[PDB]
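Query form — protein UBX domain-containing protein 6

QUESTION: What is the three-dimensional structure of this chain?
INPUT:
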Amino acid sequence: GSHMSTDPVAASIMKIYTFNKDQDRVKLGVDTIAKYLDNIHLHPEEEKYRKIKLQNKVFQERINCLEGTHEFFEAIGFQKVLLPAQDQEDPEEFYVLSETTLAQPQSLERHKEQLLAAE
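ANSWER: The C-alpha cells for UBX domain-containing protein 6 are given below.
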C-alpha cells in the first residue's frame, strides 16, 4: 500500500485481534470474509459474486457487532454504495469489490495473505 506507520489493512488486522479478545468472534469474522473472497477468487470470471449487502443476518450479528473488521473489508478494496432504486427512499448499502482493485488482483491476493499472516 502506501506503507509507513503500518498500511491500512494491516493496521485493521491488528486492531481486530487486540481490541477483541474473543477469538471466536474474530474467527467468525475471518470465516465470513475469507468465504466471500473465495467465490471471487476461485471463479474470477464470476464478477457477479462481488456484491455483499450490509443489511443481512451474518453481517449484522457478527461483522457489525465486531471490531474494525468492517474497515479491513473496505481497506482491501471494497466500497460501499447506496443502491440506484426507487423502491427504497433510504440508503440500502452494498459492499462491492471496486474496479480500483479489480485492475490489480495481486493486491487482493496480498490482502487475503495479510489476514492469514495474523501472527
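ADDITIONAL NOTE: The two ends are 20 Å apart (CA to CA).
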